Design a protein around this ligand. Sequence first.
Ligand SMILES: Nc1ncnc2c1ncn2[C@@H]1O[C@H](COP(=O)(O)OP(=O)(O)O)[C@@H](O)[C@H]1O
Ligand SMILES: Nc1ncnc2c1ncn2[C@@H]1O[C@H](COP(=O)(O)OP(=O)(O)O)[C@@H](O)[C@H]1O
Ligand SMILES: [Mg+2]
Ligand SMILES: [Mg+2]
Lengths: 371, 371, 56, 56
Amino acid sequence: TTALVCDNGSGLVKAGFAGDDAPRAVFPSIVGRPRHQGVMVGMGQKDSYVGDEAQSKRGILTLKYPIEHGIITNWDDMEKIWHHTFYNELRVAPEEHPTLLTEAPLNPKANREKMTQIMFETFNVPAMYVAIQAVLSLYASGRTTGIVLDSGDGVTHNVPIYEGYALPHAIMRLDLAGRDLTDYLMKILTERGYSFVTTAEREIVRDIKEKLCYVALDFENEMATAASSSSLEKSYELPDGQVITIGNERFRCPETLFQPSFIGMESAGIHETTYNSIMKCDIDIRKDLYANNVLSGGTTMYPGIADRMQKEITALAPSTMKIKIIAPPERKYSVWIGGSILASLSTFQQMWISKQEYDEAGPSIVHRKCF
Amino acid sequence: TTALVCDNGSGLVKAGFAGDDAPRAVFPSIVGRPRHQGVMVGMGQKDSYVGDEAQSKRGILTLKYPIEHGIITNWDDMEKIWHHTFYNELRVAPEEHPTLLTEAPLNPKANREKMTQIMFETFNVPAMYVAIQAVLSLYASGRTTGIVLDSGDGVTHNVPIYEGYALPHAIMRLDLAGRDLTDYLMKILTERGYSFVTTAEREIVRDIKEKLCYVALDFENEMATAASSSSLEKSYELPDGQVITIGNERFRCPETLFQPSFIGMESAGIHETTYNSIMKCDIDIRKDLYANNVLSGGTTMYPGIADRMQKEITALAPSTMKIKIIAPPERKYSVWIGGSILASLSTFQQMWISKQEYDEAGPSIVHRKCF
Amino acid sequence: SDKLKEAETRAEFAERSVTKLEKSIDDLEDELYAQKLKYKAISEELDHALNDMTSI
Amino acid sequence: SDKLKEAETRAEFAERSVTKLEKSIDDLEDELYAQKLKYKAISEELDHALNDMTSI
Ligand SMILES: Nc1ncnc2c1ncn2[C@@H]1O[C@H](COP(=O)(O)OP(=O)(O)O)[C@@H](O)[C@H]1O
Ligand SMILES: Nc1ncnc2c1ncn2[C@@H]1O[C@H](COP(=O)(O)OP(=O)(O)O)[C@@H](O)[C@H]1O
Ligand SMILES: [Mg+2]
Ligand SMILES: [Mg+2]
């Protein structure tokens, strides 16, 4: 039979059968209970709208993501999300399909063990396998080397790989991602008068960020230009009218990636953690990693980031090496495409964690040889 | 058995069995004791004529409404009105019929508790339920969202509802209604020479208001036109002859709704309390409320109000949203039609306040789960 | 009675005419909605081309 | 007499409604014409761009 390539993610759940080009169903991972009282009788009001249904009734819900930073903080809601994904968005019972979840690097063990225990006890799948979210993004590019920066919505991690041999001592995981950029944008919009507070209006700020923000090639020059002319002010129409005008908030929101001091984080930007991740590698594979830097994940879709990052790394790196940044147009679904490719391989067909194996060793089987 | 859908109102009591299209008996709610001496013996003169009987002998009575502004100020008279409604206008003993009263929003608790205590002790009904007068008017329109402006004769209230979830923090109750318009019309008629003072002549002024007054589309232009031409002066024949001619009093009486400063009230008109009630709602359900504005209640029957209100709201609202005002021809009985529909539902059949429940918790049961 | 019949006939025609006008305005509002969707789509496509070209 | 008054009031209401509807439909037609004008202007600009791109 065919395998189910699910990809929990944090912000958008992407799923679909193995062997295709794009995920079949992509929908936000939010579960929102209603918060008001409700007076109409017999309206058929449910107790929790999940997935894309709660992005249409969000006016009277309190949306809450079940995955904070890679890790899962609310297991009941995550179980509800998985149940919805299997039964309503794909309509395939899990009793007859292997599953291939994905997990960020350096995550707590208990999260992974609970994930496999749920998949084997509640949904009762035949066999499931958990894979690191960066190796798949490297599969999708058709490479076999390279250092991949997978800046998702929950957590940004940077896994270097050479000739198929991952370097476990050079993984640099940073917890700045799309959600923190949404919060920072929502916080700097208040400088013009627009106040978004409700958890429903966070979605509106996210839409503003997606449609308007861009990464500046040079930050100081843009700050000077936006403060003199008015060629940058782009307007946007809220879900009820009252258009708003975003000035130099456009390139200040995604600039947080390269200067995490804006949101008070100490660490260095995504332009310098990649160079540090490279320098921890051996001295003989640094040229190949320099030449095959891969971008993935949703947050790396800002217009103009593949040039800013290249300029920064070229500034840091030695002058002789060639710096090349692979930015495929299908960046958002790169991890899932790689997952489909991996699940479609014949050599991989014996790596699944078969159910009888789980019955013999318990949920701690995932840390064992079947990784 | 069948349920009795009574609707106390203030000015017209509307009642009838559940499941029909129109109330069975509609009659003014006035109780008038005779005031003169009376010399004929054996004429069979009663001590209080209630309902529609006192609108025919009003020449020698002192009519007094038992409901001032939604609240009930004279409990003995209200009990008399209910007794008349049950026994003479419907001729069904209340011992064998559930009742569904209606109550304005934000009314004093003691009024509701006394109402249920009367219904359970004096008339001894099997089970009664109290419902907010705006949710029913939303039932009758066949919608499930929308903001309903129920401008009755006692009190005008504006309850917004979305997807069946009422928003308790956005109810704007204003005490200007048909009665104040009658008093203001009676007060401005004195500018031509016609003086109505007696409580019986208030009924004549009410008839004048119903038959002649209309809401102007633009107030200043109408004031200018009525002051130059004479195409507006419509005449009306009193109950004894001596026709009267109403000039620009025609559209000045109902204009008080949109400018409550005429009768000295501070608050804003019904055109601006609806917009304020909308703006208190969340940012994502404002479009639906804009598109589904519902009118109900008697006082919204003035010829030309559904256009004036739409023009005013379109002036206030953002230019992109579409403003639509639902004004069904059966506006007057909209609340009662909705009450019949609600009482006819199977899902609602277990929400009644059964008598044994009242015996166990006292009259304060109404504020509890059985709302 | 004759005057009542005449007035009722004219009022019925007026009701029919306002129904026709409301249907016509519904049609034209729908057409304007479609053209607004057209402009939204064309502006979105132009922005997509702009971001693709600026981002290679 | 009661019936005649009812009919007359109905006629006046319907006439006023038809007047409002006519004005509104004319205004919306004007708005649609304006948006079509904007679309045609940008379309002619893009057509000039295509004419130059023929040399590209
Ligand atoms: N076109 C875009 N432009 C800018 N940011 C985007 C765009 N699309 C998605 N994002 C950001 O990326 C996030 C989605 O990232 P995604 O790759 O789905 O995370 P995950 O790894 O959990 O699947 C969104 O929250 C949004 O903030
Ligand atoms: N055809 C009409 N035109 C204008 N005003 C009316 C008309 N019919 C009723 N009214 C006004 O509405 C009041 C009746 O309102 P109603 O809806 O019966 O109040 P309630 O909510 O108490 O039932 C009357 O007092 C009268 O002033
Ligand atoms: Mg991801
Ligand atoms: Mg009422």
